[PDB]
Symmetry: D2
Subunit: 377 residues, 4 copies
C-alpha cells in the first residue's frame, strides 16, 4: 500500500520525498525525476538516497533528496541547531514576520502553533514543497506506465477571465506541444485568450489563478470501489488534489456543469463494441460510482491567485494590532503539473490495492489475468 511523505522548508538545506510500498523492479532514475522537476518549472540537484538500485526500485522505502541552491544565504537564519541570539539579532534576514498575508497559512498557522513569527509557517506551507511531491510522483508515474500502460498529463483550461477550453482533452502524443505552450494550453484559441489575460494582469500589476485538467489515459476498469466513501477513487483524488497549495475546488469530468444538466443528457451511454463496452461521451471523466470505467480520467483543479499583489491587501500587524499591508513573498501551468503528480500517486496506490504484488512482474501477471478474465466475460 503506497504512501508518500514530503519534508523540507523552502529555505532549508534540502527537500525530501519518501515513497513507501512501491513494488520492486520499476525502472526509474535520477534523470526521470529531474525531467519531471523541470516540467514543474514550465509556465509563463536530485539525489536518490535509498530504494533504487541501478535504475530499478528495490521494494523498500525510496528517499529522494532535492537540494536548495540558495542554502548558503539561509544557513544561519534556517540553521537546524541553536545560533547565538546576539549574532542573530544583527541579521536583517532574520527579522520578524508579523503581517500575515490574506489567502495564506500565515495567520491561522501562527495562532495554531503559538508562533510570534510567520517564518516557520511559510517555510513549510510554501508551494516549494510541491517539488518534493513531484519527485515522489515520478515513481508512481514510472509504475503506472510500466505496469498498466497508463499515461498522465495535464493542460490548462482557463487563466484569469479567459473563456474555458471545453473541447476534447489531449492524448499523450500532444504533451510536447502542450509543454511548449507558454500557458500549457492544448487549444490555440484558448491559448491566445489566456496569454492576453496574463498580459493585461501583468500590466495592471495584478495576479491570476486558473483551472487545470489532469488526464490519465489507459486505465483498467475497476480501480477504487463503491464499498464506502473513503474507497471511492474520486474521494481519494479529491483529497490529493485539494490538498495542493492554492487549490480551492476539484471536479471529476464535467463537475459542476453536470449538476446543471438533466439526467437524460448528464451521463455517458454505453454501446456494444468489439473488445468490450464503448461510450461516445466522457461527461463522467472516467469515474463512475467511485471507480475507473476505462474512459480517460479527467480531474480539474481550481487554483486561486497565489502571488500577493504588492500593497493591495490590507492586513494586521499581530505584534501591534495595527492596520498594515501584506508584503509579498500566475503559476497555473505548473499547478497542472503538480495535479498530474497527485493523480498519479493516487492511481498507483489504487492499482497496487487491487492488483497487489511485491515486484512489477508479479503485479503485471495479476493485471494480465484480471484483464483476461474480463475479456472472457
Amino acid at each position: 500500500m503506497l504512501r508518500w511523505i514530503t519534508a523540507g522548508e523552502s529555505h532549508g538545506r534540502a527537500l525530501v520525498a519518501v515513497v513507501e510500498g512501491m513494488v520492486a523492479g520499476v525502472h526509474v532514475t535520477s534523470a526521470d525525476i529531474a525531467d519531471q522537476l523541470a516540467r514543474r518549472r514550465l509556465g509563463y540537484a536530485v539525489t536518490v538516497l535509498s530504494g533504487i538500485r541501478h535504475g530499478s526500485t528495490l521494494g523498500g522505502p525510496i528517499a529522494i533528496e532535492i537540494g536548495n541552491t540558495e542554502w548558503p544565504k539561509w544557513e544561519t537564519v534556517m540553521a537546524a541547531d541553536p545560533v547565538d541570539p546576539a549574532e542573530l539579532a544583527d541579521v536583517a534576514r532574520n527579522a520578524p514576520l508579523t503581517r500575515p498575508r490574506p489567502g495564506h497559512a500565515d495567520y491561522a498557522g501562527m495562532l495554531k502553533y503559538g508562533f510570534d513569527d510567520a517564518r516557520p509557517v511559510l517555510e513549510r506551507a510554501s508551494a516549494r514543497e510541491t517539488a518534493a511531491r513531484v519527485a515522489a510522483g515520478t515513481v508512481a508515474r514510472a509504475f503506472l506506465r510500466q505496469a498498466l500502460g497508463v499515461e498522465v498529463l495535464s493542460h490548462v483550461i482557463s487563466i484569469g477571465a479567459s473563456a474555458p477550453y471545453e473541447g476534447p482533452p489531449p492524448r499523450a502524443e500532444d504533451l510536447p506541444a502542450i509543454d511548449a505552450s507558454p500557458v500549457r494550453a492544448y487549444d490555440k484559441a484558448a491559448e491566445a485568450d489566456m496569454i492576453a489575460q496574463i498580459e493585461a494582469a501583468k500590466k495592471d500589476g495584478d495576479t491570476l489563478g486558473g483551472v487545470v485538467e489532469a488526464v490519465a489515459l489507459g486505465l483498467p476498469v475497476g480501480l477504487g470501489s463503491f464499498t464506502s466513501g473513503d474507497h471511492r477513487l474520486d474521494s481519494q483524488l479529491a483529497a490529493a488534489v485539494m490538498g495542493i497549495q492554492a487549490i480551492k475546488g476539484v471536479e471529476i469530468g464535467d463537475g459542476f456543469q453536470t449538476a446543471r444538466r438533466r439526467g437524460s443528457r448528464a451521463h455517458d451511454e454505453m454501446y456494444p463494441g468489439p473488445d468490450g463496452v464503448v461510450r461516445s461521451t466522457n461527461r463522467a471523466g472516467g469515474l463512475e460510482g467511485g471507480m475507473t470505467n476505462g474512459q480517460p480520467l479527467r480531474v480539474r483543479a481550481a487554483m486561486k491567485p497565489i502571488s500577493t499583489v504588492p500593497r493591495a491587501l490590507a492586513t494586521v500587524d499581530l505584534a501591534t494590532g495595527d492596520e498594515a499591508v501584506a508584503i509579498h513573498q500566475c503559476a497555473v501551468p505548473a499547478a497542472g503539473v503538480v495535479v498530474e503528480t497527485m493523480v498519479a500517486l493516487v492511481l498507483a496506490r489504487a492499482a497496487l490495492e487491487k492488483f497487489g504484488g511485491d515486484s512489477l512482474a508479479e503485479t503485471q501477471r495479476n493485471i494480465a489475468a484480471y484483464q483476461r478474465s474480463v475479456a472472457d466475460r
Copy 2:
C-alpha cells in the same frame, strides 16, 4: 482519533454505523439520531447498540443500527445464509440484473468484483448508505456543539438550470425556514426559480442535479494544518464530501469562481478588531492554507442527476453483448443534509486531533486554554 464506518445493503436487514474514538461525556440520544435521519428525508427504527449510556457517550465504539422496514420482502433474495437454488429460481425478485445503468457503479463494480449480476453492487453502492452516515454524523454534531459551540447547516444553491443563489449564507437561526422550504433554499427568489426548474423537469419526465452548500459556524482558528497535503482541512473535507454518492465536484468558499478573479479581489483582507482580527469578506470559505480562520466554513458540492430517466439511457446487456435500455431503480436538498454530516465528521476529527482529551470536559479545558492563549496574544 475519530473514525467512522458504515455497513449494510439497501435491502439488507439493517444498516450499521460505527463511530470510534469519540470522547466520553457527549450528550446524544436515539431521538437526536432519528431527528437527523428525518432531516435526511426532507426535499421536494434507530437502535443504539453500544457506546452510549443514559444519553452520554462512553468513550468506546458507538454502534448504531438502522432497521430496514422492507426486510420481509427481501429476506430470501438478500438472505445472509444459503438458500435452496431451486426455490430461488422461482423468485421473480431474484432475477438477474445485467443491464448496468450509465452513471452508476453497476458496470465497473461488476467487472471489478467478477459479478454476473449487478445486485451485489447496487445494494451496497446505493445512497441508502447515506442514512448510516447521518447516524454517525449526529455524534460528531453533538460533539461539535457541546465542545466548540459549532453549528453545521446547509442550503441549496441551485437545482437544474436555476440561477445560483450567491448572496450571504444562512446562520443557524435560519435552519427552520430552510428545512421548511421544499428545496431547502435560503433565498425566496432562488427558491421559486428552483421549484420552477423541478416542475418543468417533472413534466418532461426528466431528472435534475444541483449544488448545495454546507456552512459550519463558530469554528476556532487552527483546525487542520499546512504541514502536508493530507493534513490540510480542505483536503480532508474534499475527500469526505466527494465520496458521497453522486457528488462530482467540491469547492471551498467561492471555489472555481476564485480562479477567475484577480489577486487584488480574490482574497479576504484582515482588519483590526476588539477581540481579534476581523474580515469583511469570506471568499475563502473559512479555510486558508489548510486551516480554519474563524470565518464561516463554506463547502459546496455538485450533485449529478442520480435517478435514472426511464427509457432514455442506452446501455449493454452484459449477458448477451446486445444493446439495451437502462431500467430505473432530484435529491438535492437531502444531499445538502448528507454534506452537513460529512463536514461534521471531519471537523470533529480535526478538533480531537488538536485539542485531544478522552472526555468532553477534558477536551473543553484544552479548548478553553487554547482560546485564552490566543486572546492573550
Copy 3:
C-alpha cells in the same frame, strides 16, 4: 486491505463485529460464526446484518451482531437513552463501582476518562468483547482456508505451574482431540499435569493463567515484509495478540528460549528438497526476517490470571481514599481460541496485501501464479 472493529458493552444489548475490505465470494455462514463462538466457550444469537449473501461475501463491510441474552436485566442500568435519575437511584444494580480491581482497566480507565464509576470502563474492557473478535475472525478463517488452504488452530502449553509441553505442535487433524480436552491440551501427560494444577487452585480458591500456542499451517512463503518494522509479520501478530485482554507476553516460535541459545543451535538450517527448500527444525516458528517461510507459524501468548481472587487483593475506594478489597466480576483454553482468531485476521490482511484481488477467484489466480513463479525458480 482488511480492517476489523468490535463494538459493544458486556451488558449492553449486543456486540457488533465489522470486517471491511474482505474480497467477494468467500463462503461463510451464520453457522460457521456460531461454531467458532462455541469453540470460544470451551475449557475447564448470531445475526449477519450485512456483507454476506446466500453464504457468500459481497465485498462490502460485513457486520455481525451477537445478542446478549442477559439484556432484560440490564436494559435500564445500561440503557442508551436517559433514564429518570430518581428511578435509577432505587436500582441496586446501578450502584457505584469505586473499588478498582488490581490487574484490570478499572483504575487507569477511571482516571483517564474522568469517571467516578468503574462501570463504563469494565463494560467495554471486559473479555466478553473477544466474542466479537471471534465473529470477525471467522471471516478471515474462511478466507485463509479457501484462498490458501491455510488452517489455524491452538493448544495449551501450560496452565499455572505445569511443566510446559515442548514437544511437536498439533496438525489440523488433531483439533477434535484438542477441543475435546478439558484444558485444550495436545499432550496427554501435559494435560494431566495442567488438570492437577487447576484442581489444586480450585481447592485453594485461587486463579491461574497460562501459555497458549496458535499454529497456522499451509502458509505460502513471503507474507509480511522486511522493509520496515511495521511491515514485519511478527510485529503485526504481536500487536494483534498482545492486545487481547490479559495477555502479558508474546513469542514467535521458541521465543525467549531462543535468546538463551547459541547461534549454532538457535536457527533452522535449510536443505535441498524435491519441491523446494526443507527444514528439519522450526525454532523460528515459521517467521524469519518478518516473513512467513512456509513452516508452521507458531505464536505463543502468556495470559495472566484474570479472575479476581475473592478477598485477596487490597485496593483503594476512590470515593473515600480508604483501604478496600477488590470485589470479583482460568480461561486459558479459550484464550487459545481468541489467539487463533487474531492470528487469522492478521494473516488474512497480509495475504490480501500481497495477493490483492477483489474477489476470491481473482485472489486465487494471483496466489496460483505467485506459486508457479516460485516453483519455476
Copy 4:
C-alpha cells in the same frame, strides 16, 4: 498523531529518518541525535534536513539524514542509476548472493520479491536500519522529557545462558553506570555472569542472543486505552518492539512468569497514599488493561543470536539447488538501546493522542490540567 519512517540501504549513500506530527517547540539538536547514535554503538555524520530551527522543532516533518562512511566503496554496486552491465560484471563486490542465511530475511525475501540475488534483501533488512530508528527516537525522547518529565532507559537481563537479573530495575540516575558496563548490565553479579558467557562463546567461535528491558519512568496514568485491541498501549509497544530486527519475544512487566503465578500473587495491590494510589509491586510493568498506571513501564525483548556462525549453518544455493554453507555478514546491549527508542516513539504518540496540542506549550497546558483534574479527585 506521530508517525515515523526509516529509509536507506546498509551500503547505500545514507539513511533517512522522517518524523511527522511532532509538535513545535521541542528542543532537540544534531548533537542529541549523535549522542543517541553513539549510545547505539555501545556493547561488548548526522544532518538535520528539515523540521528543526535553531534547536527547536517547527511542527512540520523532521527529516534526519545519517551518512554512510563506507559509501565510496559501494557507490557502483549500490548506485541508484544504471551502470554498464559489462563494467559491473568485472566487479568482485557485485557478485551474486544466492545462499540465504538461516534466521535471516534472505530466503523469504528473495522468493517474495522475485530476486535472484539476496543483496537487495539484506541491504534493507539489515539492523543498520536501527540507526535511522534511533535518530527518530531522539525526537520522541526530547518530547517525553520536556512535556512529561519522562525518562527512557534500558538494561540487559541476560546474555546467552546467564542467570537472569530479576532484581529491581534501574532509575535514570543509574544510566551512566549501565552505559559504562561492557554488557549494559545494571547488576554487578549478573554482569560478571554475562561477560563469562560471552567469553566462552567467543572462544567457541559462537554467537549469543539475550533479553533486554526498557524502562520508562514518570509516565502519567492513562496513556493508551482499553477501548479496543489496537488502542491498548501494550499492543502498540509489542508491535514496535517485536518489529525490531532479531526480536523473537516481547513481555510487559513479569510477562511469561506472570502466567505461571496464582491470581493471589500475580497482581499489584493498591494502597492509600498522600498524592494518590501507591503500589508496592510492579509485576504488571506499569501497564494494566492497556494503559499506563503510573508505575515504571517495563518492556522486555528477547533477541535471537543474529551474527551468522561461520561454517555452522547448512543452507541451499538457490542458483543450483545444492547444499551449501551460510557465509556470514552478540549485539544485546545495543538492542536494549533500540528498544528504548521504539518505546519512546510509541509513548510520544500515545501522549499526543491524549493531550493533543500543536506546540509543546499547548501540550504542556493540557497535561497540567489533566494532572490537576486527577489530583482534585
